[model samples]
Target chain A: SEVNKRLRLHTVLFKMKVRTLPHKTVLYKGKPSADGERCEAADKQEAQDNTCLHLEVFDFVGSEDGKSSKNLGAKFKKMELFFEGSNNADPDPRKEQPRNLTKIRTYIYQNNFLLEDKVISVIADVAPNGEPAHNDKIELFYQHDDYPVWGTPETPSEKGVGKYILSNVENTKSNPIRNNFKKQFYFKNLDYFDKLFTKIFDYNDRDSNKHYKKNVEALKGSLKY
Target chain B: VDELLKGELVPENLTEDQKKKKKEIMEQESLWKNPDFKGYNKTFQELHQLSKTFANNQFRLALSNYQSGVNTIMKNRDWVEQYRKEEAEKKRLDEKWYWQKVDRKAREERVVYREKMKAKQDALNYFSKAINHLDEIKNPDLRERPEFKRLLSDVYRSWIMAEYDLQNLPQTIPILELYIEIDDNEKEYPAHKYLASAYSFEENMIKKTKGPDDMLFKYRYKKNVHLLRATELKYGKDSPEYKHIVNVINRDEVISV
Candidate 1:
């Protein structure tokens, strides 16, 4: 508790123009049907939810000057942020099968515990032509004392506040935006993975009251020889 | 007789002693028992304790003696050990006596469980806290301490075991990196092999680390060598696990990056 109490996260903002393509998706292991039919969507929303992305965490980009930090004291709890491509919130496996899609979530933490509350969820309506999906810029923000803000080059200069940018301008055509997204931040994070990926995590003790995995397997695994 | 000397009740028996003689014996016993002892135990128990320690020393000498070797020493060590145990219990009672108030429901042996758990917990906690203390153990100030070289192995073992229980294999790598001289035999900890098996657990999870495969490739390659070392150390020639792992890495597969 003292260690956690000592960690006062001033700003943790990550901005990357991620192209949530018809191509990229995630996979979940579902059980077979009573009728013995296998390798099928397990539920009504299974197709949508399975297409998840493991959004990597980034360093807490400090003050606008990038040096001085603020002490957001111990009373602070946790905040969550999401990047919504569409109202549709969801798929993929190896030799990834692409599909039309929904929202995205990015996770963050240090020592595997979330450092603080999520500032915002940058949602893009990816229903063929969603605003965030179609916009020139996408931004998310979290404020310590002020009302939380979202939507653009509105990066804050204060302590305990942060702003992130997905795209300042849509570069999906020159593909510069999505290309920049791919070549820059995303690759940088993927390259420097263990340093970041191991630190931030989403697994927790709680389950959603709705749509929870009631039939999840045990935590123990076989000690394979 | 010893219990009687501590003023405990001696059950009566017909003609056990003449009444006057018994009364006189009781008075002397009481006087000896109450002889100005200040702490937890009566004066007589302390008196017995001193004799018990003396008896133990004599017992050791006896065992090593040409006349009585094997069984005799054991017999006295056990005797001395049991006496020391009871004395400890007596002093412990001075602090607080909460034994025998057993948990009635489901019959939990609370005291026994706690004693065992406390010992394990203390060992784990001491190792975790002192893991960092190893680096300076060989420094100028500490390197001069008595039995410094001899106890270095003990310290290394503590570091390994502490991280061992905590499930932090990565921490053990640096420790095992040093050629640990466990006795005069200059040997290495089986750290690299352990790293391969344990480190592989994270290999899959880290695949999404977006970037050119260059860094990831090097990482996985380094891991193969770690496993190779582990395999060679263990099986000497070829282990299936080592073979299987290296085979996959060498196959130019997806994880080979």
Candidate 2:
């Protein structure tokens, strides 16, 4: 259990390190077609206005096939660092957001980021036509639940989803954590996401609740001045 | 020259006299100055004067009754104080070994102490009550009399003793510090001097055995010196206790405080 937990923590670090997909990470699920490309990458969901995000979580520590039995190596395989509330998707524009969601405001939510610790099932929708559904000609009507802005009903409410989104895009551009990795880098490196990057994959330092939004009204001018 | 009897001719403003004298003048005026019964009421003046004497005697008798009643109250207070002492002595015999109630002895002592205090306070009140009664008299100027001053002076010691009983510590400034200023008698200073001596810190205040970092040492010595000074004042510079205190202050460096 302890090893799995440790493995889970490193995997979390790995998952948070994922800047491969930005706010447009969520891709729409197309209907399976008879003439399908035979590969995992070919069926990859298409990006449709930051519609959906894929997160990896596991229900157990040891592997089901008994492959990586020791330590959380089994647990580590199922990890995605962008935690439970880490989805970057937009709310349905036509549908009115609920009154209850008004108080969920946070500069942390300026860009949707998550840091949760659990294994939850992800529910994606698609057609049975044996092919990716084409939205270009289909006059698709919007449903409130269809958008990937949030997790399914099973995700706990207190995960503080969108706690890392930045409304202050200008501030992020001026200050960025990093871009150049070992061999690759962010294609369109943006500083607007520095706050979210710092919270999730801050290998340089430790973070505490000191930066988290206060549950009460807390505008601290002393620190600003 | 005397116009007291010339009331028929004299106006109200010219009557320069006190209430008692003015009352007598009005009674005489009404009888003698009236033309209707001037000669007929001759005996009436003497008869009314006798009745006045009777009223004075009754007034004095009522005051004496009140005085006697207050003194009886003081006597009862004294008896209650003595009763508490007797009761505490009875309780102390068994209380000394009743360690079962870790704080039982202390609580019991407070009970007895409070009882004694109430009695002492009552006696103090009884001594001062005469002045209070005098204040309520019809004529306020009567308070300036020598007899009222004597009544206040007589109640003073019982008042001091009550205050001393209620005192807890150097706040004991309560009795000794205040009363020593009177400079009246040779017997007076010794009372507080001995009182201060007996009231020194108890064995419980300082640990007898030694400790290097012992916290109580710094303070216990200060109180010890203060009480020593009180003793020096009592028996004078020649007394051994004075020399004893001087030696202690000289020996300890931190204890200088």
Candidate 3:
């Protein structure tokens, strides 16, 4: 029997804020055929009618253990931002972001697990009651199964757990669509986490009702980055 | 000369006594035999005899030989110049013909070599294009169609994970659910168990609403269920369906359901 071994892993998450202008749309708004389809402006318009921001998450698991585990985890891989209203709707548009969010990806491993007790520890740099000072920060946690929960350094009197940050917005090359938020996070065990992430985030499952639609609503536009 | 050869002259062909008297008269007309002449009377007599012999045809063979020699000299001079010109022209034409053939052959070989090189380069370009296209294909179906199923699977897995990381949803719940689906479909029992454990841990995190001790209990229970599933799958248990339920309970840490 192959003994189960504990392996170190990392976790990462990708987030982006897509805007749908009044005149623009997505190509593949409808269900895709066997050959596949592109997003059109009409699709964007429909999606915008429902919500201003959309969020989706994916997961993956590896066959071999310890193969993808690493200390710093998987490196930021890639990110693609698409604008529907533009004259040319490139399926992939990494070149045009103010701060490139196209290179972000996730990593995790088998042994690295996030304990459910500390999953949603919200931390703030400033005390909750007093007047907030400069550089005040807040962090939120969400769990995608199969990925390793990365651990942060412990403060003098506090317990330490991994936290993924989700919020940074900027303007793009195309003006007017100003709320182009980009999300950022780092994983300690990148390869394993990334593999697990992709499996869960399969592109085919992107539009499925089981995945993105509910999560986006749950975040309630508060997590747009 | 023809009249002489025919012997039809009336005056010039006189008798031998008349010819001798005419010769004596011509001798008296000589300028060198003046009364003031002082030497070579015997020499004069020898020249006179020579003249007589030439006129009387006494040296016919020698005269004929001299004429033939002169004619041969003139013919030799003309032939030398004409032959030289003809030989030089022939040599020049031959050289031109040789070089022309050489140049033509060299040009032909150059064209052929260029075409061969172009063909080889084209083949290499095509091979590289094929390799790059294969690299870009991340779908298992596409990869499998081209008999590159393993590579396709590997790339697809990596790309999916990478995209998730970029999306900032590494710890999202649905991702874990999807992971379970992929693992079960692929029959990667070990991976499935590991992911199931992760999912259970996440569930506990959510269940922190209930209490820490309760979360711990649930986590323990889910861990056991995953281990049991691993064991059953590896060992081929008697009741596979029942074993799956036990495995899920142990691995998932689900207190309810």
lDDT of 2 by residue, B35-103 (tens): 333344566443432332222222222233234434544555556656644654564445455474557
Best by TM-score: 1
**Docking class of predicted structure 3:** incorrect
Deviation of model 1 at A40, angstroms: 79
**Chain A TM-score relative to the true structure, per candidate:** 0.26, 0.18, 0.20
Per-residue CA lDDT of candidate 1, range B1-257, in tens?
A: 01111111111113546765756765664455532444665664334323222222222121112112112323344454454445435533334334532222113334434443444345545443333333322234334333333334444555565455546665665565552433432324265655565455445435666745665665566577676666666666566866775686677445433
Residue A100, candidate 3: C-alpha displacement in angstroms: 55
- TM-score of candidate 2 relative to the true fold: 0.24
Give the least accurate 10-residue stretch of model 3 chain B, judged by summed lDDT. B1-10
Residue A50 error, candidate 2, Å: 99
Can you tell me which runs of candidate 1 are displaced by over 4 Å?
A1-225, B1-121, B128-134, B137-150, B179-189, B208-215, B238-246, B252-257
TM-scores for the candidates: 0.25, 0.24, 0.18
Please provide, for model 2 over A1-225, each residue's C-alpha lDDT reduced to its tens digit, 9 standing for 90 to 100.
122122123222221213222211111122222322111111323222121122321122333655221212212111111111222243322222211100100111010001111222221112212223221211111112112233222223433232121221122335442212101321121121233333434532222232353322155435556
DockQ of each: 0.00, 0.00, 0.00
State the displacement of the C-alpha of residue A154, model 1, in Å, after optimal TM-score superposition: 90
Docking category of candidate 2: incorrect
lDDT of 3 by residue, B129-164 (tens): 323333433333332332233222332333333333
